[PDB]
């Protein structure tokens, strides 16, 4: 039944993630608290994380924002059928490799061509006060600024978004895969309802599917990438120490 | 056990 798989990933989706699609573009419209330089930064940290260089505290918050997201991405995933029936082992294996390429095609529904939306909804940081901060973490949210500006141009909704993770997570290509057939069949059926999803509801765009097969790969490149920038930070930054968890999913990805 | 397969397990 490929309509009760899309509509119980889709529910999934909204049932885990605090932040989706519909929600951001509310708030992003006709009030979050705008980060657009030093003194905002100060005053949005007094109000929203009340309790250290500036792009140190940032680097903070970015973490923390990350590993909440993460958990978020586990109950998803959990809910995707055939997910829990996969080896405890290739479930980590698939999060793991899985969770950033999500999280950055997810941060897209939160990004426009000025800024993103933090903090649950109730700040907003402008990409210009991004680019701002001294390297190296000036040059850390550009490339998925540009990655987002032509994901949104596909116009996509939160039912497309919510088969595309899926997609994502449910991959047979990652290293150390034990189960590699399973996990191939299981994305085939993942895949197989996108496919007809966004023939449904998009119908004017023929090539969707090819084009958000290449998003997918991109978005592997972007993680690659953004990797080594997180080595760059631990090993070159005095104060930027790692959470355990996100520690856990860099170390032995690229 | 890593601070991922608690994740899962939870
Ligand atoms: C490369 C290091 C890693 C952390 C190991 C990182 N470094 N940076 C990073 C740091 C400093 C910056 F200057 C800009 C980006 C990040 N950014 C992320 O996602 C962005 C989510 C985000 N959250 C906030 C925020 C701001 C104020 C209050 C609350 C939240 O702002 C933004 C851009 C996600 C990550 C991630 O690998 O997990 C990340």
Do not use: W
């Not at chain 1, 082992?89 to 793991?96: F, R």
């Not at chain 1, 909804?121 to 973490?137: A, Q, Y």
């Not at chain 1, 993680?223 to 920038?229: G, S, Y």
Request: hydrophobic share 45%; charged share 25%.
């Amino acid at each position: 039944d490929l309509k009760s798989l899309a509509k119980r990933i889709y529910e999934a989706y909204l049932k885990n993630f605090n932040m989706n699609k519909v929600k951001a573009r509310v708030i992003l419209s006709g009030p979050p608290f705008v980060i657009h330089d030093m003194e905002t930064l100060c005053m949005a940290e007094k109000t929203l994380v009340a309790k250290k260089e500036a792009e140190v505290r940032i680097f903070h918050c970015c973490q923390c924002t990350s590993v909440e997201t993460v958990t978020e991405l586990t109950e998803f995933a959990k809910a995707i059928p055939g997910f829990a029936n996969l080896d405890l082992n290739d479930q980590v294996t698939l999060l793991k490799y899985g969770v950033y390429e999500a999280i950055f095609a997810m941060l897209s529904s939160v990004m426009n061509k000025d800024g993103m939306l933090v903090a649950y909804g109730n700040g907003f940081i402008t990409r210009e006060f991004l680019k701002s901060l001294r390297k190296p973490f000036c040059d850390i949210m550009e490339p998925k600024f540009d990655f987002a500006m032509k994901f949104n141009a596909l116009e996509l909704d939160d039912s497309d978004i919510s088969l595309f993770v899926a997609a994502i997570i449910c991959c047979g290509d990652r290293p150390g895969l034990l189960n590699v057939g399973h996990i191939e069949k299981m994305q085939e059926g993942i895949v197989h309802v996108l496919r007809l999803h966004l023939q449904s509801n998009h119908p004017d765009d023929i090539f969707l599917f090819p084009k958000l097969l290449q998003k997918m790969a991109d978005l592997r490149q972007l993680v690659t990438e953004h990797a080594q920038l997180v080595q760059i930070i631990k090993k070159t930054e005095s104060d930027a120490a790692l959470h355990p968890l996100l520690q856990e999913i860099y170390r032995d990805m690229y | 056990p890593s601070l991922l397969k608690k994740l899962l397990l939870a």
